[PDB]
Design a protein around this ligand. Structure first.
Ligand SMILES: Cc1ccc(S(=O)(=O)NC(=O)NC2CCN(c3nccc(C(F)(F)F)n3)CC2)cc1
Ligand SMILES: Cc1ccc(S(=O)(=O)NC(=O)NC2CCN(c3nccc(C(F)(F)F)n3)CC2)cc1
Ligand SMILES: [Mg+2]
Lengths: 99, 99
């Protein structure tokens, strides 16, 4: 698709069997999805913000479908108020910014 | 331009006479630029993050040139570690996400 930006660029994703909504985020390095169970090993990781740090679980090579497009990458899972598709996955679905 | 996303989508901007680098950020509502003097009135505003809140100064109807493209909008100025062009300005330069 071609998505204008007058509202939050929210799309439907499919990850680990489930349907969720996620924000297409050119400002994020990494993809972060609210709490859920995913197959495979993971490793804890700390994400930094203005007041401090939040612990999440890094899973590698996860399959996710993003508005129809399949991709594979690292997904961080933890207590985020928004599901974010970061550049690690936007690159895998071929997304660009155009103006 | 058409910008791929393998690295941070950083562009040169021109605001208030000065050249700066800023991140094209589809995940931000608002544009936020590090400390500088701008003409006109402003009003304080609080931005929220994980550990708490950061005070910035909202200026309306500021001219900014973003990788060649002129736009006019609200710019928040304060102590941000990165210059962010949010959707309020990406909409004004006609930017879209495509995949
Ligand atoms: C103005 C401005 C924009 C962006 C940045 S940044 O340093 O480029 N980004 C950034 O700092 N984002 C943090 C915001 C809070 N966020 C978060 N909030 C709640 C929960 C979770 C977690 F860990 F579960 F995923 N994460 C973490 C990233 C700086 C200044
Ligand atoms: C995982 C995740 C991503 C994004 C969000 S969010 O709630 O969509 N975004 C967000 O929370 N961003 C905050 C990150 C820190 N940022 C900031 N950092 C330093 C300085 C300044 C200031 F005020 F000067 F501009 N701002 C504020 C925005 C949540 C979870
Ligand atoms: Mg962000």
């Amino acid at each position: 698709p071609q998505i204008t930006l007058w509202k939050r660029p929210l799309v439907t994703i499919k990850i680990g069997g489930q349907l969720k909504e996620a924000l297409l985020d050119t400002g994020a390095d990494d993809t972060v999805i609210e709490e859920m169970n995913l197959p495979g090993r993971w490793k804890p990781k700390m994400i930094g913000g203005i007041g401090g740090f939040i612990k999440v679980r890094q899973y590698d090579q996860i399959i996710i479908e993003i508005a129809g497009h399949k991709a594979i990458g690292t997904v961080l899972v933890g207590p985020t108020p928004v599901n974010i598709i970061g550049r690690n996955l936007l690159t895998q679905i071929g997304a660009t910014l155009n103006f």
